[PDB]
């Protein structure tokens, strides 16, 4: 049947059209435009705090808008809300499913979210009047493990799952209001735009997708990685983002030129990136690796600027504060470390 | 305010004492990752362990085990499997009577044994459905040499204790199937982790005790490696 053949050749036709269009705008490289900028030198950072109290590996960590409070998820069944200034434990939430892979802190501070291998996104109320932290709601409807979740406000949360689809929910009703499909692998990470009107996603197919939240469509697709994408994060202005993959490289993509802007890699690094994050200025790119430490990249010259080497096991998660003063790193050694 | 801070310290006291009460429970319970296939028969195994993801709790000699049959995920497993780099053991059930699919079991084993995050987890290998393999071998219509051409040059090993009233072709078949996994287990497992193969059927009642004994052995070897005695 010539239907599959003609669709194959149509797809190749317009795919190569997009290839040459992406090609018809690459006038230079980011390296040669930043060929004259000043290097940042050597970023020396030290472990200011070391957060202890988790029994098992830390898999996720979200930084509160307080720029002081943390939420951290460990695969022993504990959500620990944390005060980073005094290293005190504000809350310790026991979970029903031990195998949590993500956690989120509402931008208002009233609720946290967590979800893992149970396919459910649990939202917990932190600001109850009767004096307890109990399960506010359980969002069910994914057919795969939930790998990332992020609040847009205290009523809407976007969650990405292993079932290749993302979903924007309505927490008050508990009903999935939008489904974002198009990924052909496990979706691993989420990153919201500054205005939370778009969000970018990375999947286990070496592809990232830009989604419009309200309508529910995919705007742009980015390839260039060779293996699964484990972590995605936006640029502070929301006109670029960074992806970290199992192919031991990081890549900076632009939303307007629609092509990979830069690659951060080194021959001595042959382990996969587990987490990424940008500093408040966007001049530093933090990347956690499988070689047990984090690397601080000069995100404009791609030359590594520093190392955060204090963890005994795999570095799971990175987080930069809203004010940009601290960098939390979780790890499989069960310890959270703040760096400054 | 200088008063908020001591209330924070009091909340931290309560939280931390609860956390150390929960650490005794966490470190006294052993987590097992139950892997298999649609034909392997994990459901009947967990039916013997009376007492997104499913959990079963059983107790052997007052020791608690939590076995996690992941279940409701899609077929790709390279990402969520890493969530089990800390379990006591991976209980790997194989449908030994289905030769056409045995090569897909081996490969799965070969990838669990060689995965960077599972390269220290021991695998309790349950070769399930032995009565089916028995009747299939005695029927004669299905040749293991058709799927595995190295079965013609194989003989029942020395340390091979057969069941009473067992045909020797059955013994050759089951021990060849077991040694197919044991070769993978020995080619790369250098005392850091071991495979514990067991032949079981759907009516065996002593599977919980087998997992208990294999877990005891795993713990004892971990202790003997802490002291650098082995």
């Amino acid at each position: 049947q010539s239907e599959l053949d003609q669709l194959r050749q149509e797809a190749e036709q317009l795919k190569n059209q997009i290839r040459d269009a992406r090609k018809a705008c690459a006038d230079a490289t980011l390296s040669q435009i930043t060929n004259n900028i000043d290097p940042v030198g050597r970023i020396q950072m030290r472990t200011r705090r070391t957060l202890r109290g988790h029994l098992a590996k830390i898999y996720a960590m979200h930084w509160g808008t307080d720029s002081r409070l943390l939420v951290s998820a460990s695969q022993d069944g504990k959500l620990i809300i944390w005060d980073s200034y005094t290293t005190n434990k504000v809350h310790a939430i026991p979970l029903r499913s031990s195998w949590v892979m993500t956690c989120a802190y509402a931008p208002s501070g009233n609720y946290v979210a967590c979800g893992g291998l149970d396919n459910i996104c649990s939202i917990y109320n932190l600001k109850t009047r009767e004096g307890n932290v109990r399960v506010s709601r359980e969002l069910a409807g994914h057919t795969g493990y939930l790998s990332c979740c992020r609040f847009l406000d205290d009523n809407q949360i976007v969650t990405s799952s292993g079932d290749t689809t993302c979903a924007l929910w309505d927490i008050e009703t508990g009903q999935q209001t939008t489904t974002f499909t198009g990924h052909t692998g496990d979706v691993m990470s989420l990153s919201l735009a500054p205005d939370t009107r778009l969000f970018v996603s990375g999947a286990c197919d070496a592809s990232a997708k830009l989604w419009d939240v309200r309508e529910g469509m995919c705007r742009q697709t980015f390839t260039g990685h060779e293996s699964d994408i484990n972590a995605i994060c936006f640029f502070p202005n929301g006109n670029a983002f960074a992806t970290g993959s199992d192919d031991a490289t990081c890549r900076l993509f632009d939303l307007r030129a629609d092509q990979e802007l830069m690659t951060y890699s080194h021959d001595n690094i042959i382990c996969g990136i587990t987490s990424v994050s940008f500093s408040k200025s966007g001049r530093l790119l933090l990347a956690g690796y499988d070689d047990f430490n984090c690397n601080v990249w000069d995100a404009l010259k791609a030359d590594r600027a520093g190392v955060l080497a204090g963890h005994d096991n795999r570095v799971s998660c990175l987080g930069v504060t809203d004010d940009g003063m601290a960098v939390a790193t979780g790890s499989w050694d069960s310890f959270l470390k703040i760096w400054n | 305010q200088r008063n908020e801070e001591k209330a924070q310290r009091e909340a931290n006291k309560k939280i931390e004492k609860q956390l150390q009460k929960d650490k005794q429970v966490y470190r006294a319970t052993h987590r097992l990752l139950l892997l298999g296939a649609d034909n392997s028969g994990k459901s009947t195994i967990v039916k013997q362990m009376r007492i997104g993801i499913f959990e079963t709790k059983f107790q052997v000699d007052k020791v608690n085990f939590h076995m996690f049959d992941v279940g409701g995920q899609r077929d790709e497993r390279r990402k969520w499997i890493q969530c089990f780099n800390d379990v006591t053991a991976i209980i790997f059930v194989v449908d030994s009577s289905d030769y056409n699919r045995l090569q897909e079991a081996l490969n799965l084993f070969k990838s669990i044994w060689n995965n960077r995050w599972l390269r220290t987890i021991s695998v309790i290998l349950f070769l399930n459905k032995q009565d089916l393999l028995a009747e299939k071998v005695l029927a004669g219509k299905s040749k293991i040499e058709d799927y595995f051409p190295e079965f013609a040059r194989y003989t029942t090993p020395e340390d091979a204790t057969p069941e009473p009233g067992e045909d020797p072709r059955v013994t050759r078949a089951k021990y060849f199937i077991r040694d197919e996994f044991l070769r993978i287990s020995t080619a790369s497992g250098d005392g850091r982790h071991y495979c514990y193969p067991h032949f079981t059927c759907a009516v065996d009642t002593e599977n919980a005790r087998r997992i208990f004994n294999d877990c005891r052995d795993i713990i004892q070897r971990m202790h003997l490696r802490q002291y650098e005695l082995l």
Partner: nanobody
Amino acid sequence: QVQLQESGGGLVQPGGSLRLSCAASGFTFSNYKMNWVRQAPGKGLEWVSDISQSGASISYTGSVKGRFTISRDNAKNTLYLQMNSLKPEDTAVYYCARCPAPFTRDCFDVTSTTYAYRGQGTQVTVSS
């Protein structure tokens, strides 16, 4: 983009030979362990053969041992399967699969229903 295009395969009578080729692009070929998987009409994806990064280690499913020969050309980013004595039970779609991660000995999910780093497949119809 990661791309694996297969060539070869087609009509042969029992006892014939075929050279399946797999042109790779979008990644460093010398880093990944390569596989040949196949799906015969009416059943699921089954693993056929595999070869490591440099090419020393090589394995077969067993029903093809002695008949099929896997060989990689890293300098040409190509994978090859040579099949000498084709039986009727070899008619299938043949996919060239890549290992998920670039420096590992374990390759998960290569026989998955919608694995992302797999080719489209060549139809090998062996009939007389």
